[PDB]
Enzyme design. Sequence first.
Site, PDB file in Angstrom:
ATOM      1  N   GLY A  24       0.806  -1.204   0.000  1.00 43.66           N
ATOM      2  CA  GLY A  24       0.000   0.000   0.000  1.00 43.66           C
ATOM      3  C   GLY A  24       0.842   1.259   0.000  1.00 43.66           C
ATOM      4  N   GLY A  27       3.274   1.253   2.979  1.00 40.52           N
ATOM      5  CA  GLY A  27       4.182   0.129   3.151  1.00 40.52           C
ATOM      6  C   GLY A  27       3.598  -1.238   2.830  1.00 40.52           C
ATOM      7  N   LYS A  43       5.081  -5.717   9.490  1.00 44.42           N
ATOM      8  CA  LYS A  43       4.587  -4.527   8.781  1.00 44.42           C
ATOM      9  C   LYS A  43       5.714  -3.558   8.452  1.00 44.42           C
ATOM     10  CE  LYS A  43       1.366  -1.112   9.856  1.00 44.42           C
ATOM     11  NZ  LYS A  43       0.013  -0.514   9.895  1.00 44.42           N
ATOM     12  N   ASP A 134     -11.953   1.875  14.089  1.00 44.30           N
ATOM     13  CA  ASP A 134     -11.848   1.246  12.758  1.00 44.30           C
ATOM     14  C   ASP A 134     -12.359  -0.192  12.870  1.00 44.30           C
ATOM     15  OD1 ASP A 134     -11.229   1.365  10.038  1.00 44.30           O
ATOM     16  OD2 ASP A 134      -9.088   1.071  10.293  1.00 44.30           O
TER      17      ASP A 134
HETATM   18  C1  LIG Z   1      -3.346 -11.856   2.088  1.00 46.77           C
HETATM   19  O1  LIG Z   1      -4.089 -11.988   3.297  1.00 46.77           O
HETATM   20  C2  LIG Z   1      -3.586 -12.730   4.335  1.00 46.77           C
HETATM   21  C3  LIG Z   1      -3.139 -12.091   5.489  1.00 46.77           C
HETATM   22  C4  LIG Z   1      -2.638 -12.846   6.543  1.00 46.77           C
HETATM   23  N1  LIG Z   1      -2.176 -12.273   7.672  1.00 46.77           N
HETATM   24  C5  LIG Z   1      -2.174 -10.894   7.917  1.00 46.77           C
HETATM   25  N2  LIG Z   1      -2.558  -9.971   7.002  1.00 46.77           N
HETATM   26  C6  LIG Z   1      -2.552  -8.641   7.302  1.00 46.77           C
HETATM   27  N3  LIG Z   1      -2.925  -7.711   6.389  1.00 46.77           N
HETATM   28  C7  LIG Z   1      -3.618  -8.032   5.157  1.00 46.77           C
HETATM   29  C8  LIG Z   1      -3.483  -6.856   4.189  1.00 46.77           C
HETATM   30  C9  LIG Z   1      -4.150  -7.126   2.841  1.00 46.77           C
HETATM   31  C10 LIG Z   1      -5.247  -8.183   2.947  1.00 46.77           C
HETATM   32  C11 LIG Z   1      -5.995  -8.071   4.267  1.00 46.77           C
HETATM   33  C12 LIG Z   1      -5.079  -8.323   5.468  1.00 46.77           C
HETATM   34  N4  LIG Z   1      -5.488  -7.484   6.583  1.00 46.77           N
HETATM   35  N5  LIG Z   1      -2.164  -8.200   8.510  1.00 46.77           N
HETATM   36  N6  LIG Z   1      -2.145  -6.860   8.862  1.00 46.77           N
HETATM   37  C13 LIG Z   1      -1.715  -6.875  10.152  1.00 46.77           C
HETATM   38  C14 LIG Z   1      -1.504  -5.646  10.977  1.00 46.77           C
HETATM   39  C15 LIG Z   1      -2.459  -4.636  10.971  1.00 46.77           C
HETATM   40  C16 LIG Z   1      -2.266  -3.476  11.713  1.00 46.77           C
HETATM   41  C17 LIG Z   1      -1.109  -3.321  12.460  1.00 46.77           C
HETATM   42  C18 LIG Z   1      -0.144  -4.323  12.455  1.00 46.77           C
HETATM   43  O2  LIG Z   1       0.999  -4.162  13.178  1.00 46.77           O
HETATM   44  C19 LIG Z   1      -0.336  -5.483  11.711  1.00 46.77           C
HETATM   45  N7  LIG Z   1      -1.483  -8.164  10.534  1.00 46.77           N
HETATM   46  C20 LIG Z   1      -1.777  -8.980   9.492  1.00 46.77           C
HETATM   47  C21 LIG Z   1      -1.759 -10.430   9.257  1.00 46.77           C
HETATM   48  C22 LIG Z   1      -1.333 -11.373  10.329  1.00 46.77           C
HETATM   49  N8  LIG Z   1      -1.144 -10.874  11.548  1.00 46.77           N
HETATM   50  O3  LIG Z   1      -1.162 -12.551  10.055  1.00 46.77           O
HETATM   51  C23 LIG Z   1      -2.579 -14.225   6.449  1.00 46.77           C
HETATM   52  C24 LIG Z   1      -3.025 -14.866   5.307  1.00 46.77           C
HETATM   53  O4  LIG Z   1      -2.975 -16.232   5.245  1.00 46.77           O
HETATM   54  C25 LIG Z   1      -4.045 -16.954   4.628  1.00 46.77           C
HETATM   55  C26 LIG Z   1      -3.528 -14.120   4.247  1.00 46.77           C
END
Ligand SMILES: COc1cc(Nc2nc(N[C@@H]3CCCC[C@@H]3N)n3nc(-c4cccc(O)c4)nc3c2C(N)=O)cc(OC)c1
Length: 271
Positions: A24, A27, A43, A134
């Site tokens: 995005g 980042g 992240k 959010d």
């Molecule tokens: C491709 O979608 C998958 C994502 C994940 N895992 C994760 N995805 C994300 N962001 C994605 C951005 C785009 C798609 C939607 C998701 N939210 N965040 N984002 C965080 C996060 C958010 C805010 C703060 C922070 O420090 C970390 N942790 C996570 C996280 C996690 N903690 O595992 C696992 C998967 O496996 C099947 C498919």
Amino acid sequence: KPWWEDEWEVPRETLKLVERLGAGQFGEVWMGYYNGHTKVAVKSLKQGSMSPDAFLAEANLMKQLQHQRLVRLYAVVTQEPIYIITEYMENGSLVDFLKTPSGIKLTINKLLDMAAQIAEGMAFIEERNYIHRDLRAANILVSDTLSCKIADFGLARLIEDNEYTAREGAKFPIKWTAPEAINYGTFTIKSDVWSFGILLTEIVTHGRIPYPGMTNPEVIQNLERGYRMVRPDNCPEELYQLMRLCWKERPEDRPTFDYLRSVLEDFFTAT
Ligand SMILES: COc1cc(Nc2nc(N[C@@H]3CCCC[C@@H]3N)n3nc(-c4cccc(O)c4)nc3c2C(N)=O)cc(OC)c1
């Protein structure tokens, strides 16, 4: 506390970025390993896109919001490029998961189970005097055991005097955000309760956009008439009347998150 004394600071060497989950303006998000064996999410802050202080403020807030139902801060790397490292969620975002072959098979029972997990997490935030701002299914993460945790604390705030007021030039998703927050920029734990109501429609409709068929100003016009979202398809009437409580006109008339949790645990063990 300075980086050389910070328990959360880790040497960048300990980390191995394997798969990119997202990219995005500000980042990327990766799946990686910490010291070889521990699956983590990393992240990544895009140099220049936003202030490192602004970026890191999320990590500092997570230091304070440790709970089993909240996605846990693992570490930071505070030298460019900056990293916030977290607990890895194997099934990713709730909004996405509910649309996969496995998500699709979930019984209404398991749906109310997850809904209660989310309410339990919010009940913790409520007692710590924080708000989320959010809250929505895209910001709920699902684990490999079909477990749910709150995530994405970028907008979360400690609330000293009941209320956080935002700038009058700030914007929020109109469909998930409480009228008072949209209208006056005034946020409260009761504003999250309203978002929770919307999040429930997303759960029961398997990730569909709220207010089917309506534009943002149609959504505003209707709410003001006293209307609320039309009953979603395949929505238990019990659940819908619970969404209604979440959408009461006055913030203080909206239930607590602990109440919402106990109610959802009853619907769950009934089905
Ligand atoms: C491709 O979608 C998958 C994502 C994940 N895992 C994760 N995805 C994300 N962001 C994605 C951005 C785009 C798609 C939607 C998701 N939210 N965040 N984002 C965080 C996060 C958010 C805010 C703060 C922070 O420090 C970390 N942790 C996570 C996280 C996690 N903690 O595992 C696992 C998967 O496996 C099947 C498919």
